[PDB]
Amino acid sequence: PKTSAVNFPQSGPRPAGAAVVFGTKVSGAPGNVVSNNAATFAPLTGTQNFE
Amino acid sequence: TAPVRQEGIMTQGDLVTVTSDGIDLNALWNSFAESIAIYNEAMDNLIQLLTYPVTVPVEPVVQIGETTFEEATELGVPRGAGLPIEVFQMGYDLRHYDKRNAYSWMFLADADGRQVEAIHDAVLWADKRLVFRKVMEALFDNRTRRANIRNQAYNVYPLYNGDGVPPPRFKNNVFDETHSHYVISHNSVVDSSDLEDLMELLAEHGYSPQAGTQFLLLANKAETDAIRQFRRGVVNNNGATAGYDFIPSPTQPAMMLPNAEGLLGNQPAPTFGGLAVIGSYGFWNIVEEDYIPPGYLVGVGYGGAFNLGNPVGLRQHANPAMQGLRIIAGNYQRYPLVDGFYARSFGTGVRQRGGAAIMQIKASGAYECPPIYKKGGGFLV
Amino acid sequence: TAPVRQEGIMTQGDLVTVTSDGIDLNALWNS
Amino acid sequence: RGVVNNNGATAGYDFIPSPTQPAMMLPNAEGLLGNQPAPTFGGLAVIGSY
Amino acid sequence: YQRYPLVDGFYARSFGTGVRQRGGAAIMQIKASGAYECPPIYKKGGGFLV
Amino acid sequence: ALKTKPRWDKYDGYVGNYRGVLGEDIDLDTEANRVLAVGTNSNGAIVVGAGQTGIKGLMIVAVGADIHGAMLDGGINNHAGDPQDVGKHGEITNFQPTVFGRTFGVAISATEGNVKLAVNGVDTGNIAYDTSAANLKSGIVAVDDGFTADDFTVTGTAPNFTIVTTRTDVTITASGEGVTVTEATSVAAAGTNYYGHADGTVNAVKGSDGVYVGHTQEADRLIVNVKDEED
After folding, report:
1. In chain A, which residues have their Cβ closer than 8 Å to the Cβ of C22?
2. Considering only CB atoms, which chain B residues are within 8 Å of D16?
3. Using CB atoms, which residue from B51, B87, B92 is nearest to A41?
4. Which of B2, B207, B316, D38 would you call most buried, defined as having the most Cβ atoms within 10 angstroms of its Cβ?
5. What's the CA gap between B99 and B97, in Å, rounded?
């Protein structure tokens, strides 16, 4: 593949005061091996061209 | 630990305390830490070889793009020219998981901190077992998924499975829409032939020993105990004859070299990534792994000219606060109840759809997903 | 499968342009 | 390895002699793929491994 | 044609070929009987591309 | 903007309003963004209509739409095995009754001769002012429009009939003189008791299977209080 679609995760600002509805991230969690090895899928371009 | 699951509000009488004969039961919660560590190392080695952070490459479609000269004349003029171009993309799913724990005020008045820490640890263990199951299920479940982004619905894919864009042509190998890397052996017991047939599924696309591709075979004890018997030119199961020797790794017990010639193959390193390799057969490095179910072979290619990588892309949520395992304050806070949540969100998909293949060893019918890695079956391996 | 040659004056409608969803197809001719 | 012994059972491995065992001739000048077992385990004398 | 409504331009090459040392090479075709055939990919009238 | 759509306004989630998983795919054109009466099948799973248990709650499958007004297909709350929320106690706002397909009352004013109906504007073969219920079906089916008998149902007696349909894209009308057609209509009515049915519809009428799910107050709202179905 010759190029990649640029990802654009923050479309705009996020609502204030929601910070308790999402938790604190426990640091030693054994499943964090998976989410340490993960990234944000939010491509800006080519979204009508998924095949 | 046993498959027994207490749920609900923790109450007095669900308390653990020093017994009347002085046994501090609250000291004993960590007593399985060795088995949990042996399970933590096995899953982490598989995850580090099977998975990688998602990216969105623009997938090239090979195009004709032809043009030609003609013979000139001293009067008159030649014809024009023009070219086509086309591309596509692939995506990944995302899903949300959670758990709750709840205590009465009577429980929290009398409880040892060691009891609630054990419940925290057991939830952190159920979290690993979930994310590992979804990594395996992303490779083993041959069904196509749906997801949505920017109001567009798109398929999320496993390996080649008879859905989506066909594999591109390689040399004279050409592939129609039905082509699939989920296959059967056509026999009740594994052959050396099946390790040849499995290799062909990667090599038909050019992912090959000639290309410099490294190969890993993951199998259960049930299969590796047959594969250890493959001797070059000797018959195996189902009338197959082995084309190569099984070569034991440096760690295995020794063998007498049976002929002056020596064994047809190469002796592997004792590890592939972090996994312990038992030996090779042809170009496959063979790994013994009980997390592959009995009656399944998983062949995976890496490196080479085609630059193969880990088969499964891992997606996190776009909101930074949604990332990792998270502990959340509950709706009940003081009296008579306290509660709390744990939540994770992530998902998966395969972009590199030809770099691996799965064979089920049986006589007939389609491939079956092993129930332990089928999408609807549960939340634990 | 077998090659075809486009020949003629290049007009509008033979243009390659940024897609409705923002793919710069003109970054890709060297592919 | 691969030779049937008693009751129709086929061996997965060779019996490999310990270094205290008498010398033998092998079909290949490298002899073994791997080592011979250590001649003692704990304080006991080892005849070989399987 | 140079501005409006058309613009054009040309590519041109002139060259040619021949053999001097007529004995310094030879071609064999693997076949049972009949004449040597020039392969169509290298027959003079067949086109301008390999 | 253009439409309001039913939503939970109060739903607590600790008082026997419950999580489950779907036993089936939800139809996004026909069942999403509606108040569905639900039970559970012989497994642990939510079904639209009466399962093994009878009606045990209400469900709203909330689904977004694109800027062109079509439903987002790749959702994670609407396929078999997705998790969903079922309410017994709460309030639903922007409330509307739930009905599936189209249904048309046909009645004949003629006392002699023949009458004509249009299906999607194209005219039917002539039918007697005393046609059988079997011959309204046969008449309506018999045009080169591609619907066929498979998606019409007819019931009645010569003066009048109901033409039921499972699809939304077929419209009956009168076209000749001597016949009248009205499509049925449903809208919420204030101070009414609503009733879930074995179909999964929610309506103001208790027939032979209706299980009380709540009462409205002002028509735009429903106070949910499910009198759970029993054996």
Report:
1. 44-46
2. 253-256
3. B92
4. B207
5. 7
